[PDB]
Design an enzyme around this catalytic site. Sequence first.
Site, PDB file in Angstrom:
ATOM      1  N   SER A 150       4.436   7.705  -9.439  1.00 13.68           N
ATOM      2  CA  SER A 150       4.934   7.088  -8.433  1.00 13.68           C
ATOM      3  C   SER A 150       5.630   7.835  -7.554  1.00 13.68           C
ATOM      4  O   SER A 150       6.642   8.491  -8.096  1.00 13.68           O
ATOM      5  N   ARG A 151       5.264   7.832  -6.296  1.00 14.18           N
ATOM      6  CA  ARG A 151       5.911   8.713  -5.286  1.00 14.18           C
ATOM      7  C   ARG A 151       7.415   8.318  -5.235  1.00 14.18           C
ATOM      8  O   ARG A 151       8.172   9.056  -5.147  1.00 14.18           O
ATOM      9  N   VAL A 152       7.615   7.005  -4.728  1.00 15.95           N
ATOM     10  CA  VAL A 152       8.945   6.411  -4.609  1.00 15.95           C
ATOM     11  C   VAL A 152      10.120   6.693  -5.668  1.00 15.95           C
ATOM     12  O   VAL A 152      10.952   7.201  -5.278  1.00 15.95           O
TER      13      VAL A 152
END
Lengths: 49, 99, 464, 464, 120, 150, 50, 69, 47
Positions: free
Chosen positions: F26-28
């Site tokens: 996941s990026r965040v």
Amino acid sequence: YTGSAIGQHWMYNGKHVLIVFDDLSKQADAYRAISLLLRRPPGREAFPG
Amino acid sequence: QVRCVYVAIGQKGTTIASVKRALEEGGAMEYTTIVAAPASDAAGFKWLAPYTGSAIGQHWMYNGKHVLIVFDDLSKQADAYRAISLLLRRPPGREAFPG
Amino acid sequence: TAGRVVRITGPVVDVEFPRGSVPELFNALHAEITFGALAKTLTLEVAQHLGDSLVRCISMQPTDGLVRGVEVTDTGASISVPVGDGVKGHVFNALGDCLDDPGYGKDFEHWSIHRKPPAFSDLEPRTEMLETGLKVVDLLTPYVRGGKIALFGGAGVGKTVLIQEMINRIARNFGGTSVFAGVGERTREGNDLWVELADANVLKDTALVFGQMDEPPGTRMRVALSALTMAEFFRDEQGQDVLLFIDNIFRFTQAGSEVSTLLGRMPSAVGYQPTLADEMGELQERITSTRGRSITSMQAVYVPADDYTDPAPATTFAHLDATTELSRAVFSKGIFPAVDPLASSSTILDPAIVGDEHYRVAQEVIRILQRYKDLQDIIAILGIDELSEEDKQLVNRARRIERFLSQNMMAAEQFTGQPGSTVPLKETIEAFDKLTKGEFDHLPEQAFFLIGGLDDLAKKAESL
Amino acid sequence: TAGRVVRITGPVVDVEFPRGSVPELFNALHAEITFGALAKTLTLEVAQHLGDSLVRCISMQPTDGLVRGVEVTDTGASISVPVGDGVKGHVFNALGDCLDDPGYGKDFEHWSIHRKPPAFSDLEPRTEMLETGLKVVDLLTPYVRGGKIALFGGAGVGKTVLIQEMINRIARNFGGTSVFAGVGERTREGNDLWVELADANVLKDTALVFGQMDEPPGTRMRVALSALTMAEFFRDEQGQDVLLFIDNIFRFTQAGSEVSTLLGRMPSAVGYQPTLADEMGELQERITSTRGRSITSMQAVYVPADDYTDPAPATTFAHLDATTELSRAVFSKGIFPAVDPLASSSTILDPAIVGDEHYRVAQEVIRILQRYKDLQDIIAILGIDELSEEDKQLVNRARRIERFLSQNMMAAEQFTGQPGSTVPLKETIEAFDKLTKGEFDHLPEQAFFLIGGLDDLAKKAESL
Amino acid sequence: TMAEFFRDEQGQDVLLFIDNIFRFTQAGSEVSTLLGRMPSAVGYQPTLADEMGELQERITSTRGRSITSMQAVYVPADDYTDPAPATTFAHLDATTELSRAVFSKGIFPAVDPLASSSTI
Amino acid sequence: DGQCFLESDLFNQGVRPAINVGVSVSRVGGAAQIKAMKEVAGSLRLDLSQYRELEAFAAFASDLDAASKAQLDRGARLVELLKQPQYSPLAVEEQVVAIFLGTQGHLDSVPVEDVQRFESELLEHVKASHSDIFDGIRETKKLSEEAEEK
Amino acid sequence: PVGDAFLGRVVNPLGQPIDGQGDIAAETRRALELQAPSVVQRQSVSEPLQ
Amino acid sequence: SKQADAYRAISLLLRRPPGREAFPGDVFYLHSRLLERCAKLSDELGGGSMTGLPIIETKANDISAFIPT
Amino acid sequence: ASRRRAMKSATDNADDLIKALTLAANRERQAQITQEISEIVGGANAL
């Protein structure tokens, strides 16, 4: 072609010479690109026969 | 408060009916919306529906509410778009998809 | 109003018309052949407009023997087909004219073959479970009434045999009105089916019509539409449940490809039609059980070249609920019901619908077969000597459960010379649970080959 | 005078001119678009001549809302952008409009976007030892001042974080001018980096220009040209060391591919546009450090599906001298830097200008890693018990070497709470010599995770 | 033509030697693409069979006089399944193989009996 | 801004979600999840990746070291507890409680086949006794020393 | 067209009810093609979605 | 197979658009219309019966090929 | 003595998987390239 002619001139008079070609794949790519852009049919691997 | 919008593309009506029955059992129908595009319809509706859903969500965003969006299938729209493009005599591309 | 032939090639024909009158799409056009030996009248259907009152059209008879300038006449209507109560009990062609009794008909109602899908408000989901004597279909993917059935596989993997097996089971168990049709079937099997159907004394209520290979493709994609129109006519007015049988739809798709190649439109992936999904959905959504109308259908599909990368069955995958798949390796192993358990699945299997014991049994069998396949790669060279006993027992149990699924249906009566067998679901699940307990580890594996039931299992095992 | 529009299809537009009115290539054209809710000003760049006073061109704005017959005016000039000292601490688009202030940057001098690469007669090799605070880069591939640096790897690796950390460490110790250009990236990253730079004092000393992917591809090709023009102008006249930073290199390659596909050229292998190599080489000749001026540029290269056999990565490798790549396997095992020492290569590693202790340490570690990679799957299958005493000792030493390379950084503070670490060079070389001597094989497995310094390693050892 | 004249006129048994066959196929492909036809079968002549048959129909013995020949073919990319090798194998009677280890053993023929077979 | 992977191999393996954690990212990051979750849980995907790696590389191990055996046990318990059936809504407090139980090795003595059922039992008991602690979580979104002791 | 009456019903992509009963009162109608927000109008994200 | 090859070549000479393996889709119809002509008649007409034996040569023993399929 | 022969046989059988997989890979790559050229030809000549 110019390199080959320059070498052949010296060779023909008896001057021993040696010829090195750095790369030929790029020559093939350039010839293929110019042939395609000249609107000539493509072949296997999009290469002129 | 979270609002969800459902979008289905090129799917059997019976699937939508089962999904709507499931949400009716779940009791979420009060705060949900459903946008349908059955595969029987022409390519225009399938090719255009996601933009309609996007605008609908963006409105409630500019209203300031949290909006959730569900996409079922995206390759279907790609196929419809490639079909329309080839029918419009557009030159093709890699694997005949438009550029 | 007169039409003149200007240019023809292949089965496709281009015609020119006066400015005054131009018929709309999907209309019948009449022309004739003046040659002696091959005298015949032909009919064309409107395909598309080309401007300057030029119309492209498709034939369903071979186009040999034509000549330019022949007058073309129209009927100002789409294709009409006969509908009535006495339709059943006779064989029909693409035109709908009776084949067994020439001249029979032309006195019943006539309906077009171009209709529209029902409204969404009348749609209703169904969960009515259906049971069949074969153990494997009931244990893995139980059948649901009012739905769609898919039989996937390659070439020559026993699709036809199981087709008549199931149709015999349904006919013996259930009566009512039934319709059989298909495209891509041979003459010999059709005559055999007619003979067997006459033998069963049930041909009186069965509707029969189908095509053959040696025909122009127009019939190939129109006979299915005619069959669906018959099905809808019987379903709506009569209000009685009708059995529908359709075989080898794949040819249908192929047929379309051919005509598209003749049209000159831009080719698609793998040289297919510019648009195929829309027509597929139109064909599929024509089948739908209404609240007051319960309709069950089965579909036989052919996979070309034993490759599933083809979008031809991939498109159909999105329109099905219960699917059973076949593979070549299972057939080469020896068991005739070569149905892949790993790939096969159904959407009806759920603990809410069926008790938890069946769910547990299915999950355990699935996990066992998955583990067996996972270890197959290592066992392929080295074997069980390197492997541990904790997995050797798993290997043994997987082999026994795999060999147990074999069954002897009665349709093989013309090959094996032995009667068929049937087992209730309770006995099947009980026997499978007993096997998964591992009690039957002492028994030899070969005894499980082509056995009927646990009583016959014990009798055969103790007979050796 | 002006011309008209004949056909509109996608972003390409063909226009017509009277006799003696056709302009030359690479010229700016303006068109007026009106509507109740969509009124703008189209800017177009001439692409090619079709003859018959027809020229085909591309536009950098969406073509929606257009109508035929609208005259198009010509400025008789190419694309230009203002330059100056006030550009620093501001944000500009592809056209060079200040995003911070609408009225900013409309009074300074303007230069042609097109330029000419420097001649060969003013070229000179550059050799300098540039060292950062990270062990892996210091050992394997030290950086070169005034040279070319690029990174390789696929998606979801972390090169953006490393780039952030590297610019963060460098800008604090640099007196020259740094310019960042974003070819293709999400708005979130740009917003976050803008916030981070505004949080510090460096933003006044740097200039930001970028474009997104939602824009038409014509925009995505010219931003790099504007950035290179900025770099050239600031380097040539100020005569100061210039820092240039480019987000990605594959975006303009794609944009060229689709624009050439639409324009009417035949495709090529793997559906790549022709004459990509010449365009790439002509673009890359802009970046060069001259005799009196030194310019440092980094590059981040994306690979499709992580394949180095693709012609584009091989082509872009021919221009690079200092190479560093990222792989997915080392990321998968857990390393955050995720740098593979085996395939990476440098051009300044040699005993002539570097100490031979570094040379021998690198040789020993690379031989250790080569043998370890060879014996990996053998350890996996046959087990450690089948290996020799030298095999076991070397395997343990390679385990220590592989785990020892990891180190934390400042940028990880957002992701993890542990602050980063920095270490000098001599201490690292002494530690690496001690490890490769095998005097630290007694250390546990856990003591070899995310170690910045020898003292940190010892304190970790005492903790267990 | 030379060989046919010699056989038919002198009545002498004659031998025909050919260097390679794939070079002829490449020349045919070059003239095909040069004329501007529609390349087929992985860029091969669609009528390669007709030309090969025309070439090879004039080798068989008749009228008591034999015209024998042998040809050496160069397999492309270690593939026996290419259509050109498949078609040129259609008129083959005997295959012969020469190895290097067999010559290192110190023998004159340097032929392996295990890698050769005949059709008679 | 993130993706997950699902394999039919995982589904037929026995994992109902059948999501591939080996590639998922996941990026965040953890700024989205509650602070208590990131305090209780962190770097666990790395632990499971290492567990699967060592399962693959040591599937035919001649002998298992004490550290290797303990890591096998921990990975077995974690992969067993991560299972959740369909139509099973779950709240944040119960989830963080379950992960806190899993990560601290409190269930090591529990046999594998009994790991799941027992969990379903404990979540019931806290529902009737000491339920106030849950309220505290919903009032604090974090953990206290006394709450953990109780 | 856009409105709050669309809640709990089904409409075609054109925007007309297809399966429900009655009609939808939409206050306004918006064009499908628009412009995306710029970076200056954006903000960081931290709120969880359970 | 050689007949199919000849049909493909003569079709390509016609500038007809090609299909899979450059094979036009009419080949299935061609081989069919050749094939199902062989069948046993009904008893009344005479009950004649012909039996057809075609021969197909495959390369590298693969059933997964278009013409064999 | 029993140990040696099993591993010898394992080696000799392990050769075959290499051979078969190489054959399959060659077939796959040639199919891919011929499909690619056929598709590019169909795209080229249709215009």
